[PDB]
Amino acid sequence: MTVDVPVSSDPYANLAASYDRLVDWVISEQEETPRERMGDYIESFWRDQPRPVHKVLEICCGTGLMLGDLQRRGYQVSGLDRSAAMLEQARNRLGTGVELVRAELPEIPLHAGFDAVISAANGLTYLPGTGFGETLAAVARLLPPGGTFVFDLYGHGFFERFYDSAEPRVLAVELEDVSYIWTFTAPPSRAHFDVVHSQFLRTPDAEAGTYTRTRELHRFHEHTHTSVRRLAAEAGFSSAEVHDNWTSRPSTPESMYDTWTLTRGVLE
């Protein structure tokens, strides 16, 4: 339909069952960092901090790809996501002993503290500026002095790559049992950035060649370096560094993904 696709309460509800396979493709062809290398970066940062990390929360934990990596390294992990469908996959991966809470950021209905909080593979880009700042504030209240918060965002280069003309760009891939078509549009103001995620899955109990299309609107926000630094300071983080895509290289106007390392200050 040429008419606009509305924003659903859970844009991942139809994707959760095929998400892990799609991640494999984004890692191969769209520079997304493997969760093992994200974990290596996170652990290296933690090892530079004076307080040891044991309890870890991931917000926007999705199907648990990042949490599963940390579980295998020996951490006591917990997850939060707004999508029941994603969390069902995470439950299968992590087992029944891991706490997984369904909540929509900036709400974090957890009272006990964590030694560290993370968010991998760009979930925080779904938050508008106001809710992003409130999420940083909520994460700060879970951390002790010196505790860390490590997350990624789409970098400036992502927005310039996929929103560079009045005419929308289209990206597609055909995988074994699913075809995806992504159409990227943004308002003239560029206040947010939309992707229509069209997914074609074979229709069960139907003649060969039959597919069911579902469409979901994924609405992204660019959080600039200057805004992230301001909101981190407001939330009570005494330092905030950014690097290019889970490496030690500087973040630049070309970066496709930015990786933020925040340290909680000493004022409660």
Added chain:
Amino acid sequence: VDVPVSSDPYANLAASYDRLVDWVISEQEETPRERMGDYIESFWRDQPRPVHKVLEICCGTGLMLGDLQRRGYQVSGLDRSAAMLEQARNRLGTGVELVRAELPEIPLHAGFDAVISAANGLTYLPGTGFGETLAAVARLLPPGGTFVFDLYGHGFFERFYDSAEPRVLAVELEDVSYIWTFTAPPSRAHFDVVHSQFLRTPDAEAGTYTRTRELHRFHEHTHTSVRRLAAEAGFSSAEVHDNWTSRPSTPESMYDTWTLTRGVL
């Protein structure tokens, strides 16, 4: 999942083709039929013999023929696709002669003042059938009669077959979504596009689509080859320009427009 060449690659596309052409025009530099007709008419007005009877081979759904019909020419069409010709018969009416045949066969029993082929149908012919088609067209024309057609230019093959991984292009249109995958063998003897098409399923609940996949197999005919085959067919002149303009053709051209003139016997 490999796709073979169908006898009619356009059978599943004919019903959606005119709308797809609107998108190619707005995004892939295909020339509107009115501007192709303008170019053709300007070329004809440089010839000493007036043009009235016009045949288009690879006439498809009749978009080019409809433009010339509007201008007053007596038009005829040839295409191998019954599905495409059904659309052409709707646009042009029942009085226009439309013949189903696969080039190089042209089963017609009278000549034309001019022959055309618009929007790159002749790129589906390999070298041998392309040369035989030029020979068949020459035999429809009087001395000095002209043949105007387009081909994919060198820039098209460079743009879509240079990457280390096969290029994928896509769009969602009205009731149909397309994914195109561009591959070529190492020999580069031909150039393939797999046309993966999701078309709404009639009488099914909303969101049901039927996928069909068609192989479109293209050939690059170099300028040297075209001039050689034009000479062999009996054309005395053969000029090439960039995409239906008077600008010269270059290695960067996406579309080449050929203007051939039949020689004297």
